Structure 1
Amino acid sequence: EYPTVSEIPVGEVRLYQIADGVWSHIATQSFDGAVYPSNGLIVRDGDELLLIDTAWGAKNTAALLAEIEKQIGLPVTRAVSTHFHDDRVGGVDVLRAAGVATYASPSTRRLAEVEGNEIPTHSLEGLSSSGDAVRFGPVELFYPGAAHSTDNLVVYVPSASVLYGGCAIYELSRTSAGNVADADLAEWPTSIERIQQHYPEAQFVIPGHGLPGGLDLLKHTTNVVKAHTN
């Protein structure tokens, strides 16, 4: 019942209710003749919504906003990008044009600027050191340390026991690392262990791409990263 690539054309977005007041958004993007799905998160905050990550591009992100307005009907007042790559910040300009306040760590903002990517407007404080956590509306933001990228953040929704790992956490069906050009392979398993230590009660774990599961997605990602290292 989780949407797959065969069921979403590039340009369209699906929403999937994970728990009360928590959704993932699913879009697709083409790259080198392959089509990949990509996840982000939506968290209700009273009568408004917190968005986690763009839908990987301007067109997808415009469709994401339209699908949120149609299905949920609450305003997206803030958005957090969890690292500087295009599947997390691609579409920030669309969000900003729609009146969404876009946020990222100062680390992410700097890496986005170096990359020539779109740059979230606001800077998130309190996330500079591995193990740092801050409350942000209905979620906790956690910097586990370098993994998929040096700046990657994860997001926890305490009310729903939902852990969003972003691209630092792989789905079970992904058995090879793939693209790790900006990764810290040496630190990635240590950063995953910080996530496991901080969120042992998580019931749902959402990877950056593909199917949700439980906490065994953390050990899975460590296994894949260590195999790639060797």
Structure 2
Amino acid sequence: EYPTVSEIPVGEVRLYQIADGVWSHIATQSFDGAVYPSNGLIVRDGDELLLIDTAWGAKNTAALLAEIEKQIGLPVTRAVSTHFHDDRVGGVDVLRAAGVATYASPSTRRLAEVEGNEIPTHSLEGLSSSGDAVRFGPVELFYPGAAHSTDNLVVYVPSASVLYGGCAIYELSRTSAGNVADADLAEWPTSIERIQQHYPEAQFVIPGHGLPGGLDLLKHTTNVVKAHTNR
């Protein structure tokens, strides 16, 4: 039922309905000869849509917009990128050209610039300190603290009890650390516990990469990160 790499041709995107007015988007990218899936989120905002994260590249992100307009048929008016990596900002230029207002925290925008990645236009205030939350249309944005990256945000949809962890949260099948080049291993379990404290009622938890689950994914991620810490 949830799509994997084997169900997604190169440069295509799939939409998966999680709950009423809430979808994930799933795309793939090839890295060093292996193929990785990646998730974002789409949340209905009345008669418009809010996008969370690009689909990891210009071509994928163009495909995403085409699939949204085919399947849902409401305008994507705003996009939020949850950290500075290319799976989150890669395609911001496509979105911007298409008339989508692109947003990220000032932390994310600065780190994207340093990496020479695409840079969302707008800055999101009110997310600079661990435990900070702001409402953005139909979602709450939450800065849990440094984890996968120092700027990583999580997104909650209160209407549907959907928690989107992005790349701060690992799927259950992931048994060893992923890309930790930009991580704060020391703080990552603390940051996960802020998430648990703030969204204990979450019914659906979506990782940045791989299969949705429940709140078990939070402790799962903590285990993996602590094991890596002790490598």
TM-score (normalizing by structure 1): 1.00
Whole-angstrom distance in 2 between the partners of 1:90 and 1:10: 16
Whole-angstrom distance in 2 between the partners of 1:77 and 1:8: 26
- The number of residues matched between the two structures is 230
Question: Per-residue displacement from partner, 1:96-126 (whole Å, max 9, x unpaired)?
Answer: 0000000000000000000000000000000
Using the TM superposition, give the Cα deviation of residue 10 of structure 1 relative to its aligned residue in structure 2, in angstroms: 2.0
Map 1:45-194; keep pairs closer than 5 Å. 45-194=45-194
Whole-angstrom distance in 2 between the partners of 1:192 and 1:10: 33
Whole-angstrom distance in 2 between the partners of 1:51 and 1:131: 23
Whole-angstrom distance in 1 between the partners of 2:185 and 2:109: 22
Q: Which runs of 4+ in 1 moved over 2 A?
A: none
Whole-angstrom distance in 2 between the partners of 1:115 and 1:226: 27
Whole-angstrom distance in 2 between the partners of 1:66 and 1:88: 18
Whole-angstrom distance in 2 between the partners of 1:209 and 1:200: 22
Using the TM superposition, give the Cα deviation of residue 175 of structure 1 relative to its aligned residue in structure 2, in angstroms: 0.3
Question: Per-residue displacement from partner, 1:57-77 (whole Å, max 9, x unpaired)?
Answer: 000000000000000000000
Q: What 5-or-longer segments of structure 1 have no aligned partner?
A: none
Q: What 5-or-longer segments of structure 2 have no aligned partner?
A: none
Question: Per-residue displacement from partner, 1:210-229 (whole Å, max 9, x unpaired)?
Answer: 00000000000000000000
Question: Per-residue displacement from partner, 1:122-157 (whole Å, max 9, x unpaired)?
Answer: 000000000000000000000000000000000000
Q: Aligned residues: percent identity?
A: 100
Using the TM superposition, give the Cα deviation of residue 93 of structure 1 relative to its aligned residue in structure 2, in angstroms: 0.1
Using the TM superposition, give the Cα deviation of residue 86 of structure 1 relative to its aligned residue in structure 2, in angstroms: 0.2
Residue 194 of structure 2 aligns to a residue whose secondary structure is helix
TM-score (normalizing by structure 2): 0.99
Using the TM superposition, give the Cα deviation of residue 9 of structure 1 relative to its aligned residue in structure 2, in angstroms: 1.5
> How well do the aligned residues superpose, as a CA RMSD in angstroms?
0.3
Residue 217 of structure 1 aligns to a residue whose secondary structure is helix
Using the TM superposition, give the Cα deviation of residue 162 of structure 1 relative to its aligned residue in structure 2, in angstroms: 0.0
Using the TM superposition, give the Cα deviation of residue 11 of structure 1 relative to its aligned residue in structure 2, in angstroms: 0.2
Question: Per-residue displacement from partner, 1:16-52 (whole Å, max 9, x unpaired)?
Answer: 0000000000000000111000000000000000000
Whole-angstrom distance in 1 between the partners of 2:113 and 2:5: 30
Using the TM superposition, give the Cα deviation of residue 178 of structure 1 relative to its aligned residue in structure 2, in angstroms: 2.4
Using the TM superposition, give the Cα deviation of residue 177 of structure 1 relative to its aligned residue in structure 2, in angstroms: 0.3
Residue 29 of structure 1 aligns to a residue whose secondary structure is strand
Residue 165 of structure 1 aligns to a residue whose secondary structure is strand
Using the TM superposition, give the Cα deviation of residue 179 of structure 1 relative to its aligned residue in structure 2, in angstroms: 1.4
